[PDB]
Design an enzyme around this catalytic site. Structure first.
Site, short mmCIF file in Angstrom:
data_model
loop_
_atom_site.label_atom_id
_atom_site.label_comp_id
_atom_site.label_asym_id
_atom_site.label_seq_id
_atom_site.Cartn_x
_atom_site.Cartn_y
_atom_site.Cartn_z
CB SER A 242 -0.94 0.00 1.21
OG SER A 242 -1.89 -1.05 1.12
CE1 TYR A 245 -1.07 1.67 -6.81
CE2 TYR A 245 -0.35 0.15 -5.11
CZ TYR A 245 -0.74 0.39 -6.41
OH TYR A 245 -0.80 -0.64 -7.31
CD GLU A 334 -2.93 -5.56 -6.76
OE1 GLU A 334 -3.99 -5.15 -7.28
OE2 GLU A 334 -1.80 -5.35 -7.26
#
Ligand SMILES: CN(C)CC(=O)Nc1ccc2[nH]c(=O)c3ccccc3c2c1
Length: 352
Positions: A242, A245, A334
């Site tokens: 994560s 991002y 994911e």
């Protein structure tokens, strides 16, 4: 008019300052090669952004006749959404990869406009003799409750362990603060999936530009949104996945960034090991699609949190090899849901 003293603590003051910072927004627009002078923050309009998507769609149509050339259609998108390239000839959007890139860029820009439109001064405020401290006002515009946690907090350690065990062993992300997110309007709808078990606290790395929008509208499944697992809400059981991002800004010497921990109603999981950008929902009978990675936070080290009478799984162990998905196309898992109601914002983390 009297300006009332701020009722926010240093941490929450700092947060609210960052996520509404006009400089932070301009920086984001600059990082996306957008002409900040031809497109000032105060000029952003839902109309312009829509005209942009229209140009992207017609361009997408020309990628799938006697229509208009890609070079000509691209030139129009840059007419509606002014780009900055040292005053050179802009690149032709001639690939599906570049196409989705512009869509993702407009979506972020769309959340920048949301924050701007949100800060709009209403007449109610102009007819009051006393105004709140600028930060209180902004905080109230989010209509979202932010309770800062401490070391003595029960779920603090669980989150901290969750962070250090799934983060990159070298480029370690440093936990600074943790806010308890009570987005009012997310409980009512989330009570729908209260009969649905299999709950997991998952990571969602976001760039600072859309943090306000997320705190106001929650995680959304926007039109033109996509990815490796289709049109849904992306999560990760590994912080490191994560964090990739999380685009943050400089602050004297540190690199400030924000991450969300969401309570996700997974229910019956459909496991895939190959990219499927066409998905818009799970297969019949399934509530979530999961892209199994080569590794996974050791499931044997899982712990559970009691949130609103619900047992929510929270990983606590390091990533371990998953031989059953060793040759998967995903290195890290994911997690996917395809209806916004399945997600409940729980915590906001500030990392360095
Ligand atoms: C900045 N953009 C490349 C990101 C974007 O367009 N969408 C987006 C935006 C935020 C994201 N946050 C995540 O934790 C995550 C985990 C596994 C797979 C995707 C995501 C994720 C994806």
């Amino acid at each position: 008019k009297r300006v009332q003293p701020c009722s926010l603590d240093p941490a929450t003051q700092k947060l609210i300052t960052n996520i509404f910072s006009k400089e932070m927004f301009k920086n984001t627009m600059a990082l996306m090669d957008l002409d900040v002078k031809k497109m000032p923050l105060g000029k952003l309009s839902k109309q312009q952004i829509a005209r942009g998507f229209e140009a992207l769609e017609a361009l997408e149509e020309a990628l799938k006749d006697g229509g208009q050339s890609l070079e000509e259609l691209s030139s129009h998108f840059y007419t509606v959404i002014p780009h900055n390239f040292g005053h050179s000839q802009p690149p032709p959007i001639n690939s599906p990869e570049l196409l989705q890139a512009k869509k993702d860029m407009l979506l972020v820009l769309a959340d920048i406009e949301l924050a701007q439109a949100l800060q709009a001064v209403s007449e109610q405020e102009k007819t009051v003799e006393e105004v709140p401290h600028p930060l209180d006002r902004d905080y109230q515009l989010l209509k979202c409750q932010l309770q800062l946690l401490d070391s003595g907090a029960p779920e603090y350690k669980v989150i901290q362990t969750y962070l250090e065990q799934t983060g990159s062993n070298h480029r370690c992300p440093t936990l600074q603060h943790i806010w308890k997110v009570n987005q009012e309007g997310e409980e009512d709808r989330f009570q729908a999936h209260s009969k649905l078990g299999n709950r997991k606290l998952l990571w969602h790395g976001t760039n600072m530009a859309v943090v306000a929008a997320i705190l106001t509208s929650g995680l959304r499944i926007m039109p033109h949104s996509g990815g490796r697992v289709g049109k849904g809400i992306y999560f990760a059981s590994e912080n490191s996945k994560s964090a990739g991002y999380v685009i943050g800004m400089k602050c004297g010497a540190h690199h400030v960034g924000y991450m969300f921990l969401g309570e996700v109603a997974l229910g019956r999981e459909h496991h895939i090991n190959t990219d499927n950008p066409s998905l818009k929902s799970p297969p019949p009978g399934f509530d979530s699609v999961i892209a199994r990675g080569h590794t996974e936070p050791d499931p044997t080290q899982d712990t559970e949190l009691e949130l609103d009478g619900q047992q929510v799984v929270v990983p606590q162990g390091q990533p371990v090899p998953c031989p059953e998905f060793s040759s998967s196309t995903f290195s890290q898992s994911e997690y996917l849901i395809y209806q916004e109601s399945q997600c409940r914002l729980r915590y906001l983390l500030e990392v360095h």
